[PDB]
Design an enzyme around this catalytic site. Structure first.
Site, PDB file in Angstrom:
ATOM      1  N   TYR A  14       0.850  -1.211   0.000  1.00 53.65           N
ATOM      2  CA  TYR A  14       0.000   0.000   0.000  1.00 53.65           C
ATOM      3  C   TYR A  14       0.883   1.258   0.000  1.00 53.65           C
ATOM      4  O   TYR A  14       1.621   1.527   0.944  1.00 53.65           O
ATOM      5  CB  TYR A  14      -0.968  -0.048   1.182  1.00 53.65           C
ATOM      6  CG  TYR A  14      -1.841   1.172   1.427  1.00 53.65           C
ATOM      7  CD1 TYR A  14      -2.195   2.054   0.404  1.00 53.65           C
ATOM      8  CD2 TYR A  14      -2.369   1.395   2.693  1.00 53.65           C
ATOM      9  CE1 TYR A  14      -3.008   3.161   0.660  1.00 53.65           C
ATOM     10  CE2 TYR A  14      -3.192   2.483   2.947  1.00 53.65           C
ATOM     11  CZ  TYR A  14      -3.510   3.360   1.935  1.00 53.65           C
ATOM     12  OH  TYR A  14      -4.336   4.442   2.213  1.00 53.65           O
TER      13      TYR A  14
ATOM     14  N   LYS B 102      -1.688  -1.486  -4.052  1.00 53.57           N
ATOM     15  CA  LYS B 102      -2.688  -0.424  -3.918  1.00 53.57           C
ATOM     16  C   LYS B 102      -1.933   0.877  -4.102  1.00 53.57           C
ATOM     17  O   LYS B 102      -1.105   1.245  -3.264  1.00 53.57           O
ATOM     18  CB  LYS B 102      -3.396  -0.455  -2.557  1.00 53.57           C
ATOM     19  CG  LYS B 102      -4.393   0.700  -2.383  1.00 53.57           C
ATOM     20  CD  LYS B 102      -5.116   0.655  -1.026  1.00 53.57           C
ATOM     21  CE  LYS B 102      -5.990   1.901  -0.826  1.00 53.57           C
ATOM     22  NZ  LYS B 102      -6.468   1.929   0.555  1.00 53.57           N
TER      23      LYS B 102
END
Lengths: 299, 299, 299, 298
Positions: C139, C167
């Site tokens: 992320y 992400k």
């Protein structure tokens, strides 16, 4: 670096007077040079940031350099800021500075386009060649140039043959100390007037500043106080300088300074060049009051 | 905005050729103009960032503008990037662009010195006046100018009387969409070539770009593909553009482009002006291969 | 990364509802999970930024993970954001996610203290080990984390053994394309809802987003439209999403979302945790109208 | 502000020693507290950035606070850094600080999520209430927090009821002077050790710092030299501090400090918590020589 030691001192970053048609005001330029001399300034740094270099042509910058040398050569130290984005333009101004009998040249790290560090080094080398024996003052101002020089990069630049000084317009006083530690003999000008006392304590041995045009004796006073171990006086002086700088930041610094000088009967028309606008009329009373205070103080 | 609709399209940000003495190479300038026309480009944006505006004098910029108009006026659209830090200098270039018969003028937000938003507005108004009927293309490039501009500030700038377009060199595609939403009829040029397809999708209706000099047909292919709902071809073309851009970023973009154009027999000497250095010779094989690939692809 | 292919899609970054005393509101959490499932969402990303992870204890985060798995396991995909600054704390949460039968884990690049890239790498390796077979979703959110990874650094991270997705909460769509080009099979979630259409065009194959809680069907609509070559519908939907996002940015995004969900009869008390304050009363008519609008639109 | 004058001085930002399993090493924590007291430190700032707060649980932070108060209460000043992103967590730690008999609390501007200035103010007000009479030291560290407060915002924060000091970890010494000029009585701690002398000159009246754990007497020496007008000694001491700081920046500051303390027999295992890694073995000779230099100097 020891051979440039005569460049040490407190040098005003000279403002370039204009008239209401935006033309050079050469009469006011002469008056401002003499004003600075009469004040006891150590020298002048001509056509720098404060001098509105980047809104003038090469011809205009040359005309200003020429006049300042006529007025001041041999009386005080003279540093010509010759820096442009273009190396060739910078070289032209360096050659002119030499012709007019300046003591040194200076160039801001070239801006707008990203250049490699090697490209920066070559830029300084080329300007140094055209300066034909005038020492170079490297000018570092990351806040405006966008150029983020590492300590190692600064060390390489300030040891290029022909460099005799660094004008360090940075508020990083760790880096200021690091530079002094690496280069014991380097002339190191503090460039942010609002930290001058602290910059000297960190290792600067002088300064170049816009506000010295109106109150340069205060910065001389700080150098003297620190030399004598009179910390209180140094602090008091820096506080008074910062009270003034707070106001100038509110009004716009260059135009605020020109406005003070106008009220001191030095500068005929207190304008900067477009796109700088005029001082907001609401600030004029404070600026006039400051001019009066400083005139009373300098006597 | 409705009136300036004719400015919509894909326009190469023209390179300014120089020779080994760093003089203007006017013969190569004419060759490059004709090369762009033959690629089917919609227009040229002259003397911009890509055109090395900020290492040329006003006179040099004018000579280039004049030659481009001689070569291209009436055949493709012509936008004169007249921007300087100085408003007065920008005005001189705007007046010259009008005399030469340009279709529009453009100005980067003035840089180096911080100016207020009001000051930026006045700068554009002054240039628009001197443009004497030529629409203004506001040029936003925060990464180089250091001027950020809020959305509200952009909306004010692009609705000044006489503004007909925005060149948006920003990777913020939320802002791209917000601009399109506020100004449904505004000509909105995507400025970063490496997001062109995505920028169109967000709301740009065209582009101005440096890499269009060597492969402008690919960008026109992305426009066609997206108009036809052909997403896969648009992506494939953007991917191929980005393989090229990866290389150009390694080599240096302007000098890499000039080097490709040299291998394409368009530009005699592939140099940018100092302080730009030459292309590292280790990259020449890749740039030659690229030139050959693109010549094969174009026919 | 062909093993993680079943993680592709449009996943809501689940909000964590709190009661009037700022404790977990378990009943509203369960309702919100079911609300998301009924919108046709592909999955939930639990305990992320949007879930207010960083103002919850590990125990609280675990409680949320457990409840969501009870409500949703086997119905939709479940990704546990287990990231903390501490590696050991992150591992605890990864072990918990495994016990609760989540499909994948995820961790924000650890923040506050600068860590070396190797230290980042070891952090992910350790969390992957504790996840004991659950794939990892790296992320990347530079705007909040302060961590500025290079493309090369991203390439290394997403090819660590056990990493199945990225992400990418970055508006750099050049980099989005570069990542897709380097990793053709990587699951690549667009993180900024307000560029979703453009992110997919650049190479993202899905997304994770806060606003998907109130209008996830719109994002699924964009995926469908782009698959069908229907650019107009994709743009229209993105524009509508951005109209809502404009409002949510004014109100505060998480609290604005929770307030919409309150008016949709899902969330009992639309508060975020201190130091987030309440939504300004002046925005309630707009948020209520939006609730009514979206409910009439439906999934 | 003038009532909090008792908080003025040079306070070490205490490190948190860990054992080989990365748990709290209580014996080393006690040794470190005593080591600091013996150097003539004015106080300790506990569970700050330097204390690795943000990789500890609330319970772990409380355990450290309790042990330090056991070791030091009444001998030197004790400031508890209770700051978390969460206001409620920060309040829990403030309540604990009060129970343990600390002299003051402190909180970093909450980070990660952007909060409005109003939200920051309310966060401090809430923590001040939970501290139940302990003054608050606002902690400003924009380089790590990402929170960029204006001078006007700082002025408002430092005049909230219950605020008695500012820990200013910023290298902007124009701002340092402005803060001093607006607040003549405010306790104003210089936060970046490598500009300490310059920060005092600009208007700080003391400091809180990580490197004080190994050479706090040098910082006290700068304070004394500036008070005496002995500019060359102050400069000399600052230069010597910066030679050490150059090294610590190369090694990693917290782990480098812990390593020096290991060679001084204070810290048993000089590890920081993961994801911090170990010190590069190549730096051990320099850190060992520094330990010897500093022990010989004290």
């Amino acid at each position: 670096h020891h051979h440039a030691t005569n460049l040490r001192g407190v040098m005003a970053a000279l403002l370039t007077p204009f008239d209401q048609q935006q033309a050079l005001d050469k009469a006011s330029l002469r008056r401002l040079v003499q004003f600075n001399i009469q004040q006891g300034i150590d020298g002048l740094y001509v056509g720098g940031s404060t001098g509105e270099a980047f809104v003038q042509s090469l011809s205009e910058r040359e005309q200003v350099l020429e006049i300042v040398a006529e007025e001041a050569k041999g009386k005080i130290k003279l540093i010509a800021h010759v820096g442009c984005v273009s190396t060739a333009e910078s070289q032209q101004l360096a050659a002119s500075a030499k012709r007019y009998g300046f003591d040194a040249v200076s160039a801001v790290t070239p801006f707008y386009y990203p250049f490699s560090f090697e490209e920066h080094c070559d830029h300084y080398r080329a300007i140094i060649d055209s300066a034909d024996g005038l020492p170079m003052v490297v000018y570092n101002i990351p806040a405006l140039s966008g150029v983020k020089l590492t300590l190692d990069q600064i060390n390489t630049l300030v040891t290029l043959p022909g460099v005799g000084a660094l004008k360090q317009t940075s508020g990083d006083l760790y880096q200021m100390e690091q530079i002094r530690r690496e280069h014991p003999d380097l002339v190191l000008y503090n460039g942010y007037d609002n930290i001058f006392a602290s910059g000297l304590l960190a290792g600067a041995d002088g300064g170049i500043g816009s506000t010295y045009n109106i109150m340069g004796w205060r910065y001389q006073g700080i150098v003297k106080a620190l030399k004598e171990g009179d910390i209180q006086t140094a602090q008091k002086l820096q506080t008074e300088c910062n009270k003034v700088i707070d106001l100038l930041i509110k009004t716009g610094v260059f135009r605020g300074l020109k406005t003070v000088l106008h009220y001191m009967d030095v500068v005929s028309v207190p304008l900067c060049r477009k796109p700088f606008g005029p001082v907001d009329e609401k600030y004029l009373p404070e600026l006039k009051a400051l001019a009066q205070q400083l005139m009373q103080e300098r006597g």
